[PDB]
Amino acid sequence: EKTSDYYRISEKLPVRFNNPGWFHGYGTKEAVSMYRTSNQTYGSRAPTVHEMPKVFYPSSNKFSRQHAAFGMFQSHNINVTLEKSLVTGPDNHITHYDRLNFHPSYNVNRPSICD
Amino acid sequence: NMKLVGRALQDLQDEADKKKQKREEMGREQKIYNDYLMQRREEEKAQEKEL
Amino acid sequence: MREIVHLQAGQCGNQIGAKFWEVISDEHGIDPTGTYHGDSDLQLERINVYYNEATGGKYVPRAVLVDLEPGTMDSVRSGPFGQIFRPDNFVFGQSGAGNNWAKGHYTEGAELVDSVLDVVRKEAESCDCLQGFQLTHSLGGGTGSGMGTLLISKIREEYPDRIMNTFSVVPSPKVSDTVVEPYNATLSVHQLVENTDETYCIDNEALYDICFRTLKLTTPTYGDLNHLVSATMSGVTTCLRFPGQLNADLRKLAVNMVPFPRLHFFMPGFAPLTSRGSQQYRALTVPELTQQMFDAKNMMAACDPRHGRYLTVAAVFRGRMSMKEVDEQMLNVQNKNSSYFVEWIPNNVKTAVCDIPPRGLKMSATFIGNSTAIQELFKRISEQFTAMFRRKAFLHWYTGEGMDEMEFTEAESNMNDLVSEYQQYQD
Amino acid sequence: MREIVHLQAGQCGNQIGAKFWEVISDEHGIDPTGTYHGDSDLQLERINVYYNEATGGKYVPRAVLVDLEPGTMDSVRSGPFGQIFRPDNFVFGQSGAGNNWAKGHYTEGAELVDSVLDVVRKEAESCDCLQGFQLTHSLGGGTGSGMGTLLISKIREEYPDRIMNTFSVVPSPKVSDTVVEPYNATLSVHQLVENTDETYCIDNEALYDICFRTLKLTTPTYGDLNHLVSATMSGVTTCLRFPGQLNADLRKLAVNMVPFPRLHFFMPGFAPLTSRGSQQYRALTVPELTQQMFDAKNMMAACDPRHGRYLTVAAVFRGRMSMKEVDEQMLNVQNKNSSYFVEWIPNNVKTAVCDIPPRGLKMSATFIGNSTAIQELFKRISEQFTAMFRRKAFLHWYTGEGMDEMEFTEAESNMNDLVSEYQQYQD
Amino acid sequence: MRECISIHVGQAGVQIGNACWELYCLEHGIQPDGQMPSDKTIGGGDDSFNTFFSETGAGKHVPRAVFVDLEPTVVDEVRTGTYRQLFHPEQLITGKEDAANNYARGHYTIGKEIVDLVLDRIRKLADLCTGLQGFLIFHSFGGGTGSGFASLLMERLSVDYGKKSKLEFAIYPAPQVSTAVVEPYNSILTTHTTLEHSDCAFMVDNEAIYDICRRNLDIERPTYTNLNRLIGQIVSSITASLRFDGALNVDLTEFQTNLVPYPRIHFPLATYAPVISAEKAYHEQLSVAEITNACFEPANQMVKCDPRHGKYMACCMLYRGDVVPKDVNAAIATIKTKRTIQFVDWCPTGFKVGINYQPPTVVPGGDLAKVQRAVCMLSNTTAIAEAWARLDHKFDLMYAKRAFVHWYVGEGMEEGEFSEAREDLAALEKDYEEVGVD
Ligand SMILES: Nc1nc2c(ncn2[C@@H]2O[C@H](COP(=O)(O)OP(=O)(O)OP(=O)(O)O)[C@@H](O)[C@H]2O)c(=O)[nH]1
Ligand SMILES: Nc1nc2c(ncn2[C@@H]2O[C@H](COP(=O)(O)OP(=O)(O)OP(=O)(O)O)[C@@H](O)[C@H]2O)c(=O)[nH]1
Ligand SMILES: Nc1nc2c(ncn2[C@@H]2O[C@H](COP(=O)(O)OP(=O)(O)OP(=O)(O)O)[C@@H](O)[C@H]2O)c(=O)[nH]1
Structure with missing residues (x-):
């Protein structure tokens, strides 16, 4: 009555298809009378352990809706930004403009901007 | 070089257990489902008679 | 510093980028959870080329995932590394593709182009300065081509x-x-040649053939196919993130690679591919790999360039090599087939040596080629286009979307122009 | 350095090559697994003439196995040294030869010549600079003749x-x-004489008689016969691989052996063949070996040149000898039958001495002969050809393949030219 | 998300529906109560059932289908059957009067006062649905109640909902068996009304279904149970893409886009390859190659058309189970090299591949085989015009001697609508050879 006993399994199958003994609402194999309508043959037998599917792979969508909930992201934000420099030095900071923005080293003879 | 060969050798040594093992249950699952069907076949034949 | 932003587009790129990304983290050694186990200093040093820093030492992939079908995205999110991908980076729509190009190009794109522009520019501002961006998509894929054409235009x-x-x-x-x-x-390639600068051309048939050739496993997964192409895209990116005397910038490559503006179609090439008995048998040396590097069977992109000639060739070498072996190897192949190159340019070979080996092997190499082997590609689609357009079959859907015959004219007319140009330069 | 690559063709060469390779594997002391056990430095030094180096000290046979029937390849693969043979070098066809010359020469060969050339040129590129190549096959062996005639031409x-x-x-x-x-x-020999420079002549009937003469063991296996011919083929190759004051190059030999272009057919000769009690009834001395090497029964190639005369003779001596005895041995045989030589060339004897004895016997030798004993060989087939071409028996197969009787005409005409050529020069 | 609504008009169309969810409840393991065992699958109506059932916070899997009928007989014992508790009472839309096989009677006399109630159902089904890709219509051309009543509703659901798919399925009338001689009448009465509104119509024929039964299934005395279990698997296979995933997954819209070449003609042919007895698959082997050769064997199709008398346009193979592209792409490549298979020169490609790794399962107490590799073959060819050619000569005789007309005109109709359809049919054939002629 245990599916994994008779066959191998994917080890993630729901306990429904691992335990087929819980399908109690199916036909009770009543003794057939002279008045046996053909239409009642539909779903008249409960499945056995062998009818259970080997593998199971649902189309899970939990993350989707919990992400697809509400609206979808859109930039009404203030377009704040800082233009960076063309140098990696945490001290020098020069861009396409303002190229004279750096630490001036220490000259000994000619003072600042001699020319 | 030897470690590379050692890594090279062990990988080849593998993947053979994978091939061989799959074959047996293929035979097993075949045979198990085979026996079910004769049991199934005698069932309907049994069912026919009291009908 | 200079970085790259990735775009995961189309339902194929959804597999492509996913396998592409997991290779990177495993190469760098980040666990599936994300808490990087510090093991190599250099990969710790040059990880901000692609990832940013989160709290607690997790490295955020700076990529954007775009689609329409939740189930594929749910599978991607449930993949081995969906947790390391951001919900902030998952963009999509409510509609189903039908993989109509026009729908995703004019109708479906219209209400998502703004949002995808929003996420990229923020992430563009989140980072400082780029080399550029790379996009995973398909030219014949319904939604990926449709979405990509707008973005590359935008x-x-x-x-x-x-x-x-x-x-x-x-x-x-x-x-x-x-x-x-x-x-x-046909619709895609018009704007592609207009907008792009570099394109990688990949065909699945050669992937099946190489499976028969060296993989020899009969039945691999398409993810195993992704495992191969991602390794190729891994190698081209190894240059930038890894040290060693090889000039890594793609522009350093591209200026060396493209002689004239309309040349964007390039073919990959990859190094040791090994079969069952040969792993314990291959006497791995510079000569044998270079031969295998330049093998018509080792080609995987479109078809054999044996039909045509070689315009530009560039191979990147990963592992512990020296500047000399690649040198005489170049001379050996220089004299091996001197005539099979074009007389227009001699010494069209560009070699780069990545000193750090990969994880699993030491001597590997990637090759990028621009030969005269794309003619067979688009002449085929030319007869397909002309024949299917000979009687405008399947065209009623596009007219309802708002399409007419006209765009097909210049598209093939633009397409015919590049056909003649390819023969004109070489032949 | 100068090396040699082998070709294993025809279903007989399938038996022949393995035994010959197994002879080489054991003579140099390599285990069936391939891990060479270093015992002789000279064989350790000079294995690169035939084998390259794969990792683990294993010496790859640089040969190609080609056939159409897989079971023969399966058998040699399942042999004691098939693990030393290569699935890389196992080239075979999806076709049954039918042992038809034309099928394997025009129909089956067409789709097989492409791949085998790739392997051998890859093998040619694998090594540095050849002395050349050697091929095991049969002139009467249909799959061997069909392919071999094709490959030698290419x-x-x-x-x-x-x-x-x-x-x-x-x-x-x-x-x-x-x-x-x-x-x-007749078909094969026409291309053989055109494309070849050296050929060995072997006939099994002579080999059968030798067992009745000296092996005396009644019932051998064909593999035992392969050991006999491989020992001869190995013996002529010992001079290259081994040191000692003797000139080894086949070019050293061939120009000494070839006075005129049409001489390609040569007969071998071997040294002491010993019977039941004679192993311990023989005092091994050069004079008695000089006798037995020049014995009418000791020959094994075609038949007795007693009916004709000798053109050129060359004997290589393997063991601890001296040039003085072979010199006085040469004088003795020179005067023993001076008339039976051809007056055209005096001193047509060329001697080499290998100082390295084989493993199992000390003083040995090998002989290669060029005499007037092939006339009866191609006379014989001439009446066979004329008798069967008298009414064109068994021809509808070849006509259906796309062949005509005209090819047979210049075929036999070329042999008739060779018949006179051998006849005219000596007679 | 990925859901659709099934509509079942005609007491002919109701047993065939009845089998579907019986089958559907099987792979889902649904108890007739509508509840699962003590384990956890309940919620807001959301798991594998969500695409088909509505197991809402009430915890009962509510099928997303409406069963409409005009005779209360058959709809009542099913309301006393096994899964009647699962079935919604007034989604089981019943009727008290029949159409007397008259297409117009079921389209004018009573359909007016019933559709509005059904229109209440469709909006109440539409609002709860989220993705609602389209509809699943099960009917019959020669319907005593299927023909007339469906024609009105499909017109009415078209005018308000013209932006979503409508998938039509009907038993095609038996080419040489006629249970009614008014069956020809209402048939092209349906088609000419439905040609300009129907999205995709799929037709099957019962005679060849029986022919398969004693050919390879080896059943000389099958039943509707076998008939419906057969077709029930067919719709199950095409819905497995919704139910499971695969190497690649394809939705109904792609089938719409890629199967129909041009407007009007939207009538492809289905087929399912591993039709075989349990004892035959027992000691034999199944692989892509033989099921590919069999699926293109002409005698395995349920429509009495000779493909050698027609030419192929589209083909959709839906390989369900453990398969790999390698042999599949190679096997189909061999098919393209085949010469008997004559596609039109217009389409270089006509092959729509759908891979689903899930092996199709057996039905309890059933008669099918145990299959790991199964494929459904949606194809369209030009060998179909003979059926309408078989139709038109039937009419031109009967219409000329205008039999049974007093019945139709007596209840208020005229011959112009009978006159319009014949050239509409005549237009339908003439369109076929023009697209048939290259
Ligand atoms: N992910 C994935 N894509 C594949 C595979 N095999 C082929 N493809 C192709 O990759 C293409 C690109 O994917 P997308 O651009 O996302 O496709 P799409 O726009 O949604 O429309 P379709 O092409 O119809 O799927 C698809 O057209 C497929 O034809 C596969 O195994 N996995
Ligand atoms: N291997 C092997 N070959 C033999 C033996 N005896 C004679 N042979 C001959 O060696 C010849 C050469 O073999 P192949 O060239 O491979 O022959 P083939 O092309 O396959 O066709 P056939 O010559 O008709 O057998 C054959 O024709 C045989 O007749 C033997 O004992 N072993
Ligand atoms: N779909 C279906 N068709 C059936 C079934 N049994 C027989 N048939 C065939 O399908 C046709 C049924 O059409 P109709 O008889 O007009 O069905 P209806 O319009 O729902 O109303 P009724 O005439 O009362 O049955 C018959 O002519 C039969 O040939 C069945 O169970 N289902």
């Missing part, structure tokens, strides 16, 4: 100074599954 | 600067088993 104007790397797969020449693919291919 | 224009060594066995003169054999041989 990404071009505001940032016309960066690299518009693209990674598209050519569908199988024998059969494209869907009949509308040649319409999608 | 390798002529490819490498016209090397040695085209051929090892073919002549079918039994009394019965050829296959009845279309003279058709097959």
Whole structure:
């Protein structure tokens, strides 16, 4: 009555298809009378352990809706930004403009901007 | 070089257990489902008679 | 510093980028959870080229995932590394594709183009300065081509100074599954050659052939196919993130690679591919790998360039090598087939040596080629396009969307122009 | 350095090559697994003439196995040294030869010549600089003749600067088993004499008699016969691989052996063959070996040149000898029968001495002969050809393949030219 | 998300529906109560059932289908059957009067006062649905109640909902068996009304279904149970893409886009390859190659058309189970090299591949085989015009001698609508050879 006993399994199958003994609402194999309508043959037998599917792979969508909930992201934000420099030095900071923005080293003879 | 060969050798040594093992249950699952069907076949034949 | 932003587009790129990304983290040694186990200093040093820093030492992939079908995205999110991908980076729509190009190009794109522009520019501002961006999509893929054509058109104007790397797969020449693919291919390539700078051309048939050739496993997964192409895209990126005397910048490559503007179609090439008995047998040396590097069978992109000639060739070498072996190897192949190159340019070979080996092997190499082997590709689709357009079949859907015959005219007219140009330069 | 690559062709060469390779594997002391056990430095130093180096100290056989029937390849693969043979070098066809010369020469060969050339040129690129090549096959062997005639022709224009060594066995003169054999041989020999430079002549009937003469063991296996011919073929190759004051190059030999272009057919000769009690009844001395090497029964190639005369003779001596005895041995045989030589050339004897004895016996030798004993060989087939071409028996197969009787005309005409050539020069 | 609504008009169309969810409840393991065992699958109506059932916070899997009928007989014992508790009472839309096989009677006399209630159902089904890709219509051309009543509703659901798919399925009338001679009348009465509105119509024929039964299934005395279990698997296979995933997954819209070449003609042919007895698959082997050769064997199709008398346009193979592209792409490549298979020169490609790794399962107490590799073959060819050619000569005789007309005109109708359809049919054939002629 245990599916994994008779066959191998994917080890993630729901306990429904691992335990087929819980399908109690199916036909009770009543003794057939002279008045046996053909239409009642539909779903008249409960499945056995062998009818259970080997593998199971649902189309899970939990993350989707919990992400697809509400609206979808859109930039009404203030377009704040800082233009960076063309140098990696945490001290020098020069861009396409303002190229004279750096630490001036220490000259000994000619003072600042001699020319 | 030897470690590379050692890594090279062990990988080849593998993947053979994978091939061989799959074959047996293929035979097993075949045979198990085979026996079910004769049991199934005698069932309907049994069912026919009291009908 | 200079970095790259990735775009995961189309339902194929959804597999592509996923396998592409997991290779990177495993190469760098980040666990599936994300808490990097510090083991190599250099990969710790040059990880901000692609990832940013989160709290607690997790490294956020700076990529954007775009689609329409939740189930594929749910599978991606449930993948081995969906947790390391951001919900902030998952963009999509409520509609189903039908993989109509026009729907995703004019109708479906219209309400998502704004949002995808929003996420990229923020992430563009989240980072400092780029080399450019790379895109995973397909030319014949319904939604990926549709979405990409808009972005590459839109990404071009505001940032016309960066690299518009693209990674598209050519569908199988024998059969494209869907009949509308040649319409999608012909429509796409018009703006592609207009907007792009670099394109990788990939075909699945050669992937099946190389499976028969060296993989020899009969039945691999398409993810195993992704495992191969991602390794190729891994190698081209190893240059930038890894040290060693090889000039890594793609522009350092591209200026060396493209002689004239309309040349964007390039083919990959990869190094040791090994079969069952040969792993314990291959006497791995520079000569044998270079031979295997330049093998017509080692080709995987479109077809054999044996039919045509070689315009530009560039191979990157990963592992512990020296500047000399590649030198005489170049001379050996220089004299091996001197005539099979074009007399227009001699010494069209560009060699780069990545000193750090990969994880699993030491001597590996990637090759990028621009030969005269794309003619067979687009002449085929030319007869497909002309024949299917000979009687405008399957065209009623596009007219309802708002399409007419006219765009097909200049598209093939633009397509015919590049056909003649390819023969004109070489032949 | 100068090396040699081997070709294993025809279903007989399938038995021949393995035994010959197993002879080489054991003579140099390599285990069946391949891990060479270093015991002799000279064989350790000089294995690169035939084997390259794979990792783990294993010496790869640099040969190609080619056939159409997989079971033969399966058998040699399942052999004691098949693990030393290569699935890389296992090239085979999806076709049954039918042992038809034309099928394997025009139909089956067409789709097989492409791949085998790739392997050998890859093998040619694998090594540095050849002495040339050697081929094991049969002139009467249909799959061997069909492919071999094709391959020798192609390798002529490819490498016209090397040695085209051929090892073919002549079918039994009394019965050829296959009845279309003279058709097959006449076809093949026409291309063989055109493309070759050296050939060995081998006949199994002579080999059968030798067992009745000296082996005396009644019932051997064909593999035992392969040991005999391999020992001869190995013996002529010992001079290259081993040190000692003797000139080894086949070019050293061939120019000394070839006075005129049409001489390609040569007969071998071997040294002491010993019977039941004679192993301990023989005092091993050069004079008695000088006797037995020049014995009318000791020959094994075709038949007795007693009916004719000798053109050129060359004997290589393997063991601890001196030039003085072979010199006085040379004088003794010179005066023993001075008339039986041809007055055209005096001193047509060329001697080499290998100082390295074989493993198992100390003083040995090998002989290669060029005499007037082939006339009866191709006379025989001439009446066979004329008798069967008298009414064109078994021809509808060849006509259906796309062949005509015209090819047979210049075929036999070329042999008739060779018949006079051998006849005219000596007679 | 990925859901659709099934509509079942005609007491002919109701047993065939009845089998579907019986089958559907099987792979889902649904108890007739509508509840699962003590384990956890309940919620807001959301798991594998969500695409088909509505197991809402009430915890009962509510099928997303409406069963409409005009005779209360058959709809009542099913309301006393096994899964009647699962079935919604007034989604089981019943009727008290029949159409007397009259297409117009079921389209004018009573359909007016019933559709509005059904229109209440469709909006109440539409609002709860989220993705609602389209509809699943099960009917019959020669319907005593299927023909007339469906024609009105499909017109009415078209005018308000013209932006979503409508998938039509009907038993095609038996080419040489006629249970009614008014069956020809209402048939092209349906088609001419439905040609300009129907999205995709799929037709099957019962005679060849029986032919398969004693050919390879080896059943000389099958029943509707076998008939419906057969077709029930067919719709199950095409819905497995919704139910499971695969190497690639394809939705109904792609089938719409890629199967129909041009407007009007939207009538492909289905087929399912591993039709075989349990004892035959027992000691034999199944692989892509033989099921590919069999699926293109002409005698395995349920429509009495000779493909050698027609030419192929589209083909959709839906390989369900453990398969790999390698042999599949190679096997189909061999098919393209085949010469008997004559596609039109217009389409170089016509092959729509759908891979689903899930092996199709057996039905309890059933008669099918145990299959790991199964494929459904949606194809369209030009060998179909003979059926309408078989139709038109039937009419031109009967219409000329205008039999049974007093019945139709007596209840208020005229011959112009009978006159319009014949050239509409005549237009339908003439369109076929023009697209048939290259
Ligand atoms: N992910 C994935 N894509 C594949 C595979 N095999 C082929 N493809 C192709 O990759 C293409 C690109 O994917 P997308 O651009 O996302 O496709 P799409 O726009 O949604 O429309 P379709 O092409 O119809 O799927 C598809 O057209 C497929 O034909 C596969 O195994 N996995
Ligand atoms: N291997 C092997 N070959 C033999 C033996 N005896 C004679 N032969 C001959 O060696 C010849 C050469 O073999 P192949 O060239 O491979 O022959 P083939 O092309 O396959 O066709 P056939 O010559 O008709 O057998 C054959 O024709 C045989 O007749 C033997 O004992 N072993
Ligand atoms: N779909 C279906 N068709 C059936 C079934 N049994 C027989 N048939 C065939 O399908 C046709 C049924 O059409 P109709 O009889 O007009 O069905 P209806 O319009 O729902 O109303 P009724 O005439 O009362 O049955 C018959 O002519 C039969 O040939 C069945 O169970 N289902």
